[PDB]
């Protein structure tokens, strides 16, 4: 049954718009295969098209906004794009039609509507670019009857090992096609759909913009050569219209020019399936997908008071679809430093200068290939896999489709190396690398990241104890399926746990340091004077100067999270030998959080260092870090420590702002200093952990039940209203929120853990 379910999931999720880095494109979950991408741009002059043309995602003044209105990666969805520069409201509908043995079929409608400010006679170029990698695969544009290009549909027939036989059709579409009366029309046609079929070495096929411009430029050079000049120039759109040359190749460029509004379809027909897909199929499946999305949303994301209104529902749908609609498939080599230089052990004072010296040896090399199936923080700015982000992204996704989430966990855990390391940032392939400065590409095997994917595993453990529809929950409906998944993942989890302990260990024994356990103490590797990138809270203030005797209460809490998980999963597999070990680790972390990290004088948790005089010193900076044992679910409901944290969480002059909890307290000397990333702004991921823990305390007998209930109520309201208010004003989710003004700031399109707001609204943790 497990294998059966495995196979149905593979066939179900194979195809998608899995290229989140571009406005619209498709590719299957196969490294070297068929990929498509859309481009468009107005043409007004002889030189504007190069500046107007859209392909990879961006966010600036000339783009109003864009995003998925509805999406489900089993069925497809609809994306809206509001382009001010090109005067166009674009819509791209995508739909999957299950069938055959090769992952099924799919279709897309592309619709462009000029906005109110565009000239009614705007010319717009639209290109559908298609490429295929693979040694023994073939793709061929059937040539047109007509001399100079196509009056109707363009049909590409192809074959490969992974897809078998298939046909990909770009329809003629609806809309006015401009006509040139120039002499050029004798050799180039008066204006029509054209195809160029080309070949390049497989590894550059992703470079669609340059490949296309190299063809445009060759066209313009042909004009110059054949005496078409400024005495009497062809119209711009004709100058940028490729000469028709369909054929066989691993690249096919299909180019249309439209005057005014347009629309056209793309129909991918898997030959092994029924009859080929048609436009009338597309329209039906589109309408159907929406119905299904609507029904599932209302059930899984049942917004509770005071967010029951339709305004909130539209908001929740937008935040959710953008999160799930970011899922991408990535494939290629990544840049890793595998020197294991000994400077990276950071055992001396001043270690940061040493580690920089080793970095400047530049011993990094490309390795893999790797593949990854993952959601992403931000389409225009962070279109790739981030380890601790991914745990937050999957919490809402798992609610919607637990099997999709488990698939993404599996994907991430299959990257893990023999030591138990997964790189915090997955930059796979030249395409992914293109959008990332070289200095920032290299991954370091001593860098951890918060293990937030354990949070998702925890939700799945609890659910397991207590056609597309069936597939989405098959891992909890079939209890032997679930346990098998856990049996196979479990050794990897254990390895990650052991890896943390060997690589991110702090030093008790070697200092005058007293504590319940000799073993349990942690220090994030990777810190510079100014930063601690690996903890995820980049510039949150830490002991100065950084020092080999530092201990980090965040990191120790993340270890608590992990043991708790390994206890539940261990139990389920009756790994009683292991369960007993974890139980003692937990017990010790519980004690050592107190002995090493608790400040009586301050009433909160603190990181620790070693003095000038070699003594242990707490260094307290009140903010997210201070609450960590609480955020991560390690405190008993009656703990007096918990009571004191509830005081600090609730205190307006410290963390509590009208807009959510501040990353750092207004009292700390580092409030609003430096780059001010984690030194005052309100962050939805950490607020989310707070809300979940307040709620937990609120719904059990104990001395803080009602303080927690008051805080839960108000923080849930403040968080959701902050994000909603900004969405309404700007159309964006943002990375963080300003505690003084409420405004969203930094990275836009941040879906992204900001989307956790859909789970907060729907409550019932
Ligand atoms: C020098 C670049 C640092 C930017 N990091 C922020 C974005 C992201 O890295 C991806 O969402 C998160 O993983 C971090 O934790 C955030 O702080």
């Amino acid at each position: 049954l497990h294998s059966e379910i495995g196979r149905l999931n593979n066939q179900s999720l194979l195809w998608g718009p899995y290229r989140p880095n571009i406005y619209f494109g498709t590719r299957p979950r196969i490294g070297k295969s068929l990929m498509t991408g859309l481009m468009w741009g107005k043409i007004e002059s002889y030189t504007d098209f190069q500046h107007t043309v859209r392909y990879t995602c961006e966010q600036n003044e000339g783009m109003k906004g864009y995003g998925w209105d509805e999406y489900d990666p089993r069925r497809g969805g609809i994306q809206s794009i509001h382009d001010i520069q090109n005067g166009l409201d674009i819509t791209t509908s995508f739909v999957k039609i299950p069938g055959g043995a090769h992952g099924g079929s799919w279709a897309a409608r592309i619709k462009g509507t000029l906005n109110d400010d565009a000239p009614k006679d705007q010319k717009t170029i639209v290109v559908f670019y298609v490429s295929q990698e693979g040694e023994n695969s073939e793709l061929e544009a059937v040539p047109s009857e007509n001399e100079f290009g196509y009056e109707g549909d363009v049909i590409l027939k192809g074959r490969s090992e992974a897809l078998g036989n298939y046909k990909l059709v770009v329809t003629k579409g609806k809309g006015v096609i401009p006509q040139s009366d120039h002499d050029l029309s004798r050799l180039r046609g008066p204006g029509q759909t054209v195809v160029q079929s080309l070949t390049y070495p497989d590894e550059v096929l992703w470079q669609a913009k340059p490949i296309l411009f190299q063809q445009l430029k060759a066209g313009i050079d042909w004009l110059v050569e054949n005496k078409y000049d400024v005495a009497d120039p062809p119209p711009p759109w004709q100058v940028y219209l490729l000469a028709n040359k369909p054929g066989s190749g691993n690249v096919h460029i299909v180019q249309k020019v439209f005057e005014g509004d347009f629309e056209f379809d793309i129909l991918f027909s898997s030959e092994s399936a029924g009859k080929e897909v048609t436009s009338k199929d597309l329209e039906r499946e589109v309408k159907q997908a929406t119905e299904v999305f609507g029904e599932r949303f209302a059930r899984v994301f049942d917004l509770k008071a005071p967010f029951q209104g339709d305004n909130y529902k539209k908001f929740g749908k937008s935040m959710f679809s953008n999160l799930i609609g970011g899922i991408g498939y990535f494939y290629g080599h990544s840049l890793v430093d595998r020197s294991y230089a000994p400077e990276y052990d950071e055992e001396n004072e001043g270690f940061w200068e040493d580690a920089a010296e080793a970095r400047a040896r530049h011993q990094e090399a490309l390795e893999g290939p790797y593949e990854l199936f993952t959601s992403i923080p931000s389409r225009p700015f962070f279109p790739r896999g981030f380890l601790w982000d991914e745990g937050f992204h999957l919490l809402p996704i798992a609610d919607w489709d637990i099997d999709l989430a488990l698939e993404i966990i599996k994907s991430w855990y299959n990257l893990m190396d023999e030591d138990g390391w997964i790189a915090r940032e997955q930059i796979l392939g030249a395409e992914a690398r293109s959008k990332v400065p070289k200095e920032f590409q290299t991954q370091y095997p001593h860098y951890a990241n918060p293990p937030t994917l354990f949070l998702v595993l925890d939700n799945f453990v609890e659910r397991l104890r207590k056609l597309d529809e069936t597939l989405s929950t098959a891992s909890v409906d079939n209890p032997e399926v679930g346990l098998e998944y856990l049996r196979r993942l479990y050794p990897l989890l254990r390895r990650q746990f052991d890896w943390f302990r060997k690589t991110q260990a702090g030093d008790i024994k070697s200092y005058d340091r007293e504590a319940y356990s000799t073993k349990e103490a942690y220090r994030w590797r990777g810190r510079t004077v100014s930063h601690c990138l690996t903890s995820g809270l980049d510039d949150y203030p830490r002991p100065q100067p950084p020092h080999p005797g530092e201990l980090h209460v965040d990191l120790m809490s993340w270890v608590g999270v992990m043991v708790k998980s390994l206890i539940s999963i261990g139990s389920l597999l009756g790994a009683t030998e292991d369960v007993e070990f974890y139980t003692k680790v937990l017990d010790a972390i519980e004690h050592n959080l107190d002995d090493l990290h608790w400040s009586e004088k301050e009433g909160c948790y603190c990181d620790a260092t070693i003095d000038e005089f070699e003594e242990h010193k707490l260094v307290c900076h009140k903010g997210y870090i201070s609450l960590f044992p609480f955020l991560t679910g390690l405190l008993k409901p009656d703990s007096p420590k918990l009571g004191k944290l509830l005081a600090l969480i609730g205190d307006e002059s410290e963390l509590w702002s009208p807009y959510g909890l501040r990353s750092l307290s207004k009292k700390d000397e580092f409030y609003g200093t430096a780059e001010n990333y984690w030194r005052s702004p309100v962050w939805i991921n950490i607020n989310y952990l707070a809300i979940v823990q307040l709620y937990n305390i609120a719904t059990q007998d104990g001395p803080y039940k009602e303080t927690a209930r008051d805080l839960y109520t108000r923080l849930r309201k403040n968080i959701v209203e902050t994000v909603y208010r900004n969405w309404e004003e700007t159309g964006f989710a943002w990375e963080q929120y300003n505690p003084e003004t409420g405004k969203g700031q930094r990275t836009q399109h941040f879906t992204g853990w900001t989307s956790l707001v859909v789970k907060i609204m729907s409550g019932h943790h």
Side-chain angles (χ1 to χ4, degrees), residues 501 503-508 510-511 513 515-518 520-522:
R501 291 154 76 67
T503 63
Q504 313 295 318
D507 196 339
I508 311 163
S510 137
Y511 294 103
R513 213 163 230 186
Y516 177 102
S517 166
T518 35
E520 294 305 323
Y522 299 98

Side-chain angles (χ1 to χ4, degrees), residues 377 382 386 388-389 424 533 536 538 677-678 683 735 750 753:
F382 300 111
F386 287 77
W388 89 302
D389 301 48
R424 52 170 281 241
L533 249 282
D538 319 340
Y677 237 86
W678 291 87
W683 288 86
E735 186 179 356
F750 195 78
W753 59 50

